[PDB]
Design an enzyme around this catalytic site. Structure first.
Site, PDB file in Angstrom:
ATOM      1  N   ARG A  22      -6.777  -4.430  -3.993  1.00 51.67           N
ATOM      2  CA  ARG A  22      -5.910  -4.741  -5.126  1.00 51.67           C
ATOM      3  C   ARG A  22      -5.192  -6.079  -4.967  1.00 51.67           C
ATOM      4  NH1 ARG A  22      -0.200  -4.268  -4.141  1.00 51.67           N
ATOM      5  NH2 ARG A  22      -0.241  -3.036  -2.204  1.00 51.67           N
ATOM      6  N   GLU A  59      14.553   1.949   8.909  1.00 54.29           N
ATOM      7  CA  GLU A  59      13.774   2.503   7.805  1.00 54.29           C
ATOM      8  C   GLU A  59      13.693   4.021   7.888  1.00 54.29           C
ATOM      9  OE1 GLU A  59       9.591   2.504   7.743  1.00 54.29           O
ATOM     10  OE2 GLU A  59       9.436   1.741   5.691  1.00 54.29           O
ATOM     11  N   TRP A  81      10.831  -4.161   2.519  1.00 55.83           N
ATOM     12  CA  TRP A  81      10.538  -3.659   1.185  1.00 55.83           C
ATOM     13  C   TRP A  81      11.063  -4.561   0.078  1.00 55.83           C
ATOM     14  CZ3 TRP A  81       6.873  -0.405   0.274  1.00 55.83           C
ATOM     15  CH2 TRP A  81       6.523   0.543   1.243  1.00 55.83           C
ATOM     16  N   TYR A 107       9.260   7.541  -0.570  1.00 58.39           N
ATOM     17  CA  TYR A 107       9.344   8.384   0.622  1.00 58.39           C
ATOM     18  C   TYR A 107      10.675   9.126   0.712  1.00 58.39           C
ATOM     19  CZ  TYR A 107       5.603   5.097   1.951  1.00 58.39           C
ATOM     20  OH  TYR A 107       4.474   4.309   1.973  1.00 58.39           O
ATOM     21  N   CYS A 167       1.890   5.261   1.614  1.00 57.89           N
ATOM     22  CA  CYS A 167       0.780   5.026   2.529  1.00 57.89           C
ATOM     23  C   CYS A 167       0.645   6.158   3.539  1.00 57.89           C
ATOM     24  CB  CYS A 167       0.966   3.685   3.231  1.00 57.89           C
ATOM     25  SG  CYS A 167       0.756   2.311   2.099  1.00 57.89           S
ATOM     26  N   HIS A 168       1.733   6.492   4.230  1.00 61.17           N
ATOM     27  CA  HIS A 168       1.774   7.704   5.043  1.00 61.17           C
ATOM     28  C   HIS A 168       2.132   8.844   4.095  1.00 61.17           C
ATOM     29  CE1 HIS A 168       5.132   4.888   5.603  1.00 61.17           C
ATOM     30  NE2 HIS A 168       5.943   5.915   5.422  1.00 61.17           N
ATOM     31  N   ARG A 187      -3.127   7.339   4.019  1.00 62.68           N
ATOM     32  CA  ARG A 187      -4.220   7.126   3.074  1.00 62.68           C
ATOM     33  C   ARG A 187      -4.809   5.728   3.205  1.00 62.68           C
ATOM     34  NH1 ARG A 187      -3.059   3.688  -0.769  1.00 62.68           N
ATOM     35  NH2 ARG A 187      -0.862   3.218  -1.230  1.00 62.68           N
ATOM     36  N   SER A 188      -3.982   4.739   3.537  1.00 57.49           N
ATOM     37  CA  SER A 188      -4.452   3.377   3.752  1.00 57.49           C
ATOM     38  C   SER A 188      -3.532   2.722   4.767  1.00 57.49           C
ATOM     39  CB  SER A 188      -4.481   2.567   2.449  1.00 57.49           C
ATOM     40  OG  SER A 188      -3.177   2.225   2.023  1.00 57.49           O
ATOM     41  N   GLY A 189      -4.121   2.148   5.808  1.00 60.47           N
ATOM     42  CA  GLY A 189      -3.328   1.558   6.863  1.00 60.47           C
ATOM     43  C   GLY A 189      -3.639   0.099   7.104  1.00 60.47           C
ATOM     44  N   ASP A 190      -2.627  -0.750   6.956  1.00 59.97           N
ATOM     45  CA  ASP A 190      -2.732  -2.153   7.342  1.00 59.97           C
ATOM     46  C   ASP A 190      -2.662  -2.209   8.862  1.00 59.97           C
ATOM     47  OD1 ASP A 190      -2.664  -4.875   7.642  1.00 59.97           O
ATOM     48  OD2 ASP A 190      -0.711  -5.155   6.684  1.00 59.97           O
ATOM     49  N   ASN A 198       4.126   2.017  11.666  1.00 56.81           N
ATOM     50  CA  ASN A 198       4.117   3.422  11.274  1.00 56.81           C
ATOM     51  C   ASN A 198       3.988   4.347  12.475  1.00 56.81           C
ATOM     52  OD1 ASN A 198       2.131   2.304   8.531  1.00 56.81           O
ATOM     53  ND2 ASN A 198       4.316   2.820   8.469  1.00 56.81           N
ATOM     54  N   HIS A 228      -8.114  -0.601   7.428  1.00 52.30           N
ATOM     55  CA  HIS A 228      -8.615  -1.915   7.058  1.00 52.30           C
ATOM     56  C   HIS A 228      -7.861  -3.013   7.793  1.00 52.30           C
ATOM     57  CE1 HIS A 228      -5.412  -0.815   4.190  1.00 52.30           C
ATOM     58  NE2 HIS A 228      -5.050  -2.079   4.306  1.00 52.30           N
ATOM     59  N   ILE A 229      -8.554  -4.130   8.002  1.00 54.84           N
ATOM     60  CA  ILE A 229      -7.977  -5.344   8.565  1.00 54.84           C
ATOM     61  C   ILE A 229      -8.113  -6.441   7.522  1.00 54.84           C
ATOM     62  CG2 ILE A 229      -8.276  -7.178  10.257  1.00 54.84           C
ATOM     63  CD1 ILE A 229      -9.015  -5.082  12.314  1.00 54.84           C
TER      64      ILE A 229
HETATM   65  N1  LIG Z   1       0.043  -5.192   2.689  1.00 54.97           N
HETATM   66  C1  LIG Z   1       1.181  -4.508   3.067  1.00 54.97           C
HETATM   67  N2  LIG Z   1       2.182  -4.238   2.271  1.00 54.97           N
HETATM   68  C2  LIG Z   1       3.221  -3.538   2.864  1.00 54.97           C
HETATM   69  N3  LIG Z   1       4.379  -3.139   2.242  1.00 54.97           N
HETATM   70  C3  LIG Z   1       5.176  -2.468   3.148  1.00 54.97           C
HETATM   71  C4  LIG Z   1       4.524  -2.445   4.360  1.00 54.97           C
HETATM   72  C5  LIG Z   1       5.034  -1.808   5.630  1.00 54.97           C
HETATM   73  C6  LIG Z   1       5.594  -2.798   6.633  1.00 54.97           C
HETATM   74  C7  LIG Z   1       5.909  -4.118   6.252  1.00 54.97           C
HETATM   75  C8  LIG Z   1       6.430  -5.031   7.195  1.00 54.97           C
HETATM   76  C9  LIG Z   1       6.637  -4.626   8.534  1.00 54.97           C
HETATM   77  C10 LIG Z   1       7.195  -5.553   9.573  1.00 54.97           C
HETATM   78  O1  LIG Z   1       6.953  -5.346  10.762  1.00 54.97           O
HETATM   79  N4  LIG Z   1       7.944  -6.562   9.084  1.00 54.97           N
HETATM   80  C11 LIG Z   1       8.652  -7.615   9.739  1.00 54.97           C
HETATM   81  C12 LIG Z   1       8.536  -7.837  11.134  1.00 54.97           C
HETATM   82  C13 LIG Z   1       9.246  -8.870  11.780  1.00 54.97           C
HETATM   83  C14 LIG Z   1       9.120  -9.107  13.258  1.00 54.97           C
HETATM   84  O2  LIG Z   1       8.162  -8.365  13.889  1.00 54.97           O
HETATM   85  O3  LIG Z   1       9.842  -9.913  13.842  1.00 54.97           O
HETATM   86  C15 LIG Z   1      10.094  -9.691  11.014  1.00 54.97           C
HETATM   87  C16 LIG Z   1      10.228  -9.483   9.631  1.00 54.97           C
HETATM   88  C17 LIG Z   1       9.520  -8.451   8.974  1.00 54.97           C
HETATM   89  C18 LIG Z   1       9.713  -8.280   7.483  1.00 54.97           C
HETATM   90  O4  LIG Z   1       8.844  -7.830   6.737  1.00 54.97           O
HETATM   91  O5  LIG Z   1      10.943  -8.662   7.032  1.00 54.97           O
HETATM   92  C19 LIG Z   1       6.322  -3.303   8.904  1.00 54.97           C
HETATM   93  C20 LIG Z   1       5.803  -2.394   7.965  1.00 54.97           C
HETATM   94  C21 LIG Z   1       3.278  -3.127   4.169  1.00 54.97           C
HETATM   95  C22 LIG Z   1       2.121  -3.455   5.027  1.00 54.97           C
HETATM   96  O6  LIG Z   1       2.065  -3.135   6.212  1.00 54.97           O
HETATM   97  N5  LIG Z   1       1.127  -4.136   4.421  1.00 54.97           N
HETATM   98  O1  LIG Z   2       3.967   2.143   5.653  1.00 57.12           O
HETATM   99  C1  LIG Z   2       3.065   1.428   5.231  1.00 57.12           C
HETATM  100  C2  LIG Z   2       3.120   0.642   4.008  1.00 57.12           C
HETATM  101  C3  LIG Z   2       2.066  -0.125   3.645  1.00 57.12           C
HETATM  102  N1  LIG Z   2       0.886  -0.199   4.372  1.00 57.12           N
HETATM  103  C4  LIG Z   2      -0.245  -1.077   3.876  1.00 57.12           C
HETATM  104  C5  LIG Z   2      -1.576  -0.356   3.643  1.00 57.12           C
HETATM  105  C6  LIG Z   2      -2.199  -1.310   2.642  1.00 57.12           C
HETATM  106  O2  LIG Z   2      -2.752  -2.430   3.300  1.00 57.12           O
HETATM  107  C7  LIG Z   2      -1.000  -1.697   1.770  1.00 57.12           C
HETATM  108  C8  LIG Z   2      -0.804  -0.771   0.557  1.00 57.12           C
HETATM  109  O3  LIG Z   2      -1.702  -1.052  -0.507  1.00 57.12           O
HETATM  110  P1  LIG Z   2      -2.397   0.117  -1.397  1.00 57.12           P
HETATM  111  O4  LIG Z   2      -3.410   0.828  -0.348  1.00 57.12           O
HETATM  112  O5  LIG Z   2      -1.459   1.019  -2.124  1.00 57.12           O
HETATM  113  O6  LIG Z   2      -3.414  -0.731  -2.331  1.00 57.12           O
HETATM  114  O7  LIG Z   2       0.127  -1.604   2.642  1.00 57.12           O
HETATM  115  C9  LIG Z   2       0.773   0.542   5.573  1.00 57.12           C
HETATM  116  O8  LIG Z   2      -0.227   0.535   6.291  1.00 57.12           O
HETATM  117  N2  LIG Z   2       1.870   1.319   5.942  1.00 57.12           N
END
Ligand SMILES: Nc1nc2[nH]cc(Cc3ccc(C(=O)Nc4cc(C(=O)O)ccc4C(=O)O)cc3)c2c(=O)[nH]1
Ligand SMILES: O=c1ccn([C@H]2C[C@H](O)[C@@H](COP(=O)(O)O)O2)c(=O)[nH]1
Ligand SMILES: O=c1ccn([C@H]2C[C@H](O)[C@@H](COP(=O)(O)O)O2)c(=O)[nH]1
Lengths: 285, 283
Positions: A22, A59, A81, A107, A167-168, A187-190, A198, A228-229
């Protein structure tokens, strides 16, 4: 231990198929994975890359309080967020009448008030909905052999009102030999940014509930759907994969807490955490 | 070569026998339990109907059609010859849960209700819920046809609000679908699986559902990922499973859909044919 996560990174890099998503960026995707992380005398805070532990702790407390306001979490220094609650992002979803930071029924709302009629983030939902978090704690205290100890954040009815679907999505708790275990379905993990965050998140939650119910932490089973990566995470993860993991730190709870709602951020202390330098991996949106 | 075949199920049986801890459950019997397991079953030109023990295929097919119709009436499934839900809908059992005002067979808001009308106010089994609730089963079919790369194709039967009204909380609580290279795959989260009786039944159940949705969406069936929470073997099942574990599995059969069906509601039991199924004698 940590090699299981690194093994999943390698498997996706070597056997993952290309799949667009997406966010317009690409991914290397694998569907269906499972890892096991021990919680016995250790806490799975990754050492091959510094994990945003301050964000993990705030969080989870932000989830426990039932908050769905990104401003509530960002004001604690955790801005993870803020992108999903911004005015531009809420408008892209059609939420023009929502104040900035209203993530919708996410959540925190589903854990504490599942089934309640969601209005906005500043509403009072006391007594409304199902308190799954307290229901699982009471079930463990009285019937630890129960195979239904589940906390589910996936609400199809509230789904179109969410800024980002969970996601979780679902977690289950398990007790045997006075050991508390937890399996999470993501369901989907970055794998680059979200998954390490997580893992520590639900490991911390299991430590909280084990402390409340007087049980010993056991295992954390991490089950993934779309693992996914992102394409811009390939080169950073190749660097992390060439790092030698160090011993996991340990988590110490400083005072005797009776209710899950009494946990403060000052009640937790990570000891012996010496991670590798942080790797910047940009969030996809 | 192992791969994604019946050897994985037999391997899970062996692992529970060797590493499963004793754990009592809600029933009077005990179990040997392991928490957290995952197996992969191929759906490509074959159907994972286990061969080391005959599987109640008629029950698998009728129960899935019973789910798709949105029915929560155990008598509706019992009239087709599948009496697996009759115990949870009996008059004695409904009273033991406090449902004294329910007619016998009213299982409450269960799979059929949650799949088709999630979030609707449940009255009884004879009510009309047209236009009420979320039709997850149709939503996943529409999402696959139009946005196959979506990572949210989820059908969830675990409803904490409707949970106290159910005769039995869902064991297979959530499943997710996945599309790549025109291949449809499905992962199921089963909170607790009876490896002896339930797990072989549940594997063919969700493999059949993947064949139905793939047929409608014009995709090829891929893999079925079976994720288990409490994977347990009942103590009175140990000796029968040790006999089954010493059997050589035979090749998986093939599933043939006889006619071109356009909507999930048009599938009849006479539209499916299992060919080449040669299981071992029942134990
Ligand atoms: N695609 C995509 N969308 C997503 N939406 C929400 C998440 C979950 C999520 C986002 C960010 C982190 C993190 O670790 N953030 C930071 C780390 C550091 C550091 O390590 O110093 C400094 C700043 C931040 C920040 O974000 O302010 C952890 C979980 C997520 C995802 O995982 N993927
Ligand atoms: O706690 C979280 C929040 C977000 N994501 C990642 C998974 C996806 O890469 C993206 C969410 O996108 P959708 O799968 O909803 O398209 O954020 C996580 O792995 N863990
Ligand atoms: O589709 C199903 C339904 C039931 N069971 C088994 C698992 C448990 O042994 C029992 C349900 O008991 P609880 O987990 O709710 O205690 O039935 C299955 O394996 N599959």
């Amino acid at each position: 231990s940590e090699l299981q996560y690194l093994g999943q990174i390698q498997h996706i890099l070597r056997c993952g198929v290309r799949k667009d998503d997406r966010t317009g960026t690409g991914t290397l995707s694998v569907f269906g994975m499972q890892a096991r992380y021990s919680l016995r005398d250790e806490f799975p805070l990754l050492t091959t890359k510094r994990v945003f532990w301050k964000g993990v702790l705030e969080e989870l407390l932000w989830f426990i309080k039932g908050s769905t306001n990104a401003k509530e979490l960002s004001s604690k220094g955790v801005k993870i967020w803020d992108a999903n609650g911004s005015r531009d992002f809420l408008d892209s979803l059609g939420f023009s009448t929502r104040e900035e930071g209203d993530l919708g029924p996410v959540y925190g709302f589903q854990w504490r008030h599942f089934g309640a009629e969601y209005r906005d983030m500043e509403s009072d939902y006391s007594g409304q909905g199902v308190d799954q978090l307290q229901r699982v704690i009471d079930t463990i205290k009285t019937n630890p052999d129960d195979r239904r100890i589940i906390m589910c954040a996936w609400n199809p009815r509230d789904l179109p009102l969410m800024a980002l679907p969970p996601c979780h999505a679902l977690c289950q708790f398990y007790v045997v030999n006075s050991e508390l275990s937890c399996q999470l379905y993501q369901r989907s993990g970055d794998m680059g940014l979200g998954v390490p965050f997580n893992i520590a998140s639900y490991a911390l939650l299991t430590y909280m509930i084990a402390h409340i119910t007087g049980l010993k932490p056991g295992d954390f089973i991490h089950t993934l759907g779309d693992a996914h990566i992102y394409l811009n995470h390939i080169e950073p993860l190749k660097i992390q994969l060439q790092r030698e993991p160090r011993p996991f730190p340990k988590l110490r709870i400083l005072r005797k807490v009776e209710k899950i709602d009494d946990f403060k951020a000052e009640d937790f202390q990570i000891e012996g955490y010496n991670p590798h330098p942080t790797i910047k991996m940009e969030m996809a949106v």
